[PDB]
Amino acid sequence: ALPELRELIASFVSEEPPEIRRIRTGTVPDLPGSYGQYFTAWDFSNSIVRDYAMNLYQLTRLATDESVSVENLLTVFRTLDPIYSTFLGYNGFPVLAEYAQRVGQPAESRAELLDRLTTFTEYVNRLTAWSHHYFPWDLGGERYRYARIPVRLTWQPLGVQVDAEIYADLNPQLATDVLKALPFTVLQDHAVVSGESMYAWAPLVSVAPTPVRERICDAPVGRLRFSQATGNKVIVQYGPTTETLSSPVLGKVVDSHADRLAEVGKAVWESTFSSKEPVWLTVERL
């Protein structure tokens, strides 16, 4: 459907998109940002592309709902998309805006529209992944400070390796979807709002049901969860949190390897919040 987006998705799994490089260095054409700075444009670029990616996934889900006609889906997309994609096109993402218009073109079938949305969502998810990695989350930390399928996870250049287990029965189609994407190597980043957890944008768009979920605060060390709605992310719980929402249970790092995760979470913290030195997560079947 969108063969060029497929090539860019394959490239950006290991290479920084030039869109993200220009935004974070303040070299976007036509210089966005009032009065000689580009932080405000950087703030809008990072957050809008993220929330745009959230809309695109929920629209992909809507494309699977057969109670809504294909013509209605296109009507919903043509109304909700432009205010986001037009701004993103003039603020660092011209290719994004290009294929946003193309996704909204008339579709011959629900399968074609779903194929556009699924491919376009993964492409925007990867732009969000890189944008999240390079956004200066510690900029305000100075003056806003408070008072059983076996698999293998590897973090480089840390060199840490752990064995894990995918639960293929709890969320069957979800586990199947993640297992189908193996092996992959993507950037490993940290949560920036809440919890001692890290997530990595995995190369897939799963619309599987998630009947089996577990409260985050009760998630054990080494818990493998997955978040479709925030970008199809593999999440590793390495420490405590008080958030009471529930996340789909994907798997668990084995008991004898779970104590190895604390040093990963600390380094992944340092990279997401400060140094921006890449940490690469590899997930593979054993």
User: Cis (ω within 30 of 0) for the bond into 211?
Assistant: no
Determine if 191 is a binding residue for ligand A1L46 (CB under 6 A).
Answer: yes
Determine if 91 is a binding residue for ligand A1L46 (CB under 6 A).
Answer: yes
Among the listed ranges 77-85, 92-100, 110-118, 177-185, the one in contact with a second copy (CB under 8 A) is 77-85
d(CA 28, CA 12): 19
Determine if 194 is a binding residue for ligand A1L46 (CB under 6 A).
Answer: yes
147 vs 193, which CB is nearer to ligand A1L46? 193
Whose CA is closest to 55, among 2, 128, 131? 128
Whose CA is closest to 57, among 103, 2, 121? 121
Q: Which two tokens stand for residue 217?
A: 């605060």
54 vs 181, which CB is nearer to a second copy? 54
Report the half-sphere exposure of 168 (CA within 13 A, side-chain side): 8
- Reduced to 3 states (helix: H, G, I; strand: E, B; else coil), residue 156 is strand
* DSSP summary character for residue 273: I
The entry of ligand A1L46, a second copy, none near residue 75 (CB within 5 to 8 angstroms by kind) is a second copy
Binding mask 99-138 for a second copy (x = CB under 8 A): -------------------------------------xxx
217 vs 286, which CB is nearer to a second copy? 217
Alpha-carbon distances, residue 286 vs 9, 20, 115, 166 (angstroms): 25, 34, 31, 11
Rama region for 92: left / alpha / beta (φ>0; ψ in -120 to 50; rest) = left
10 vs 217, which CB is nearer to ligand A1L46? 217
| Torsion of Cα atoms, 143 then 50 then 78 then 116, to 10° | 170
Which residues of this protein are in contact with ligand A1L46, per CB under 6 A?
Answer: 32, 44, 48, 83, 87, 90-91, 191-194, 227, 230, 243
Residues that bind a second copy (CB under 8 A): 26, 30-44, 47-48, 51, 54-55, 58-59, 61-62, 65, 67-69, 71-72, 75-76, 79-80, 83-84, 86, 90-91, 136-141, 143-146, 190-196, 229-230, 241-243, 245, 269, 273
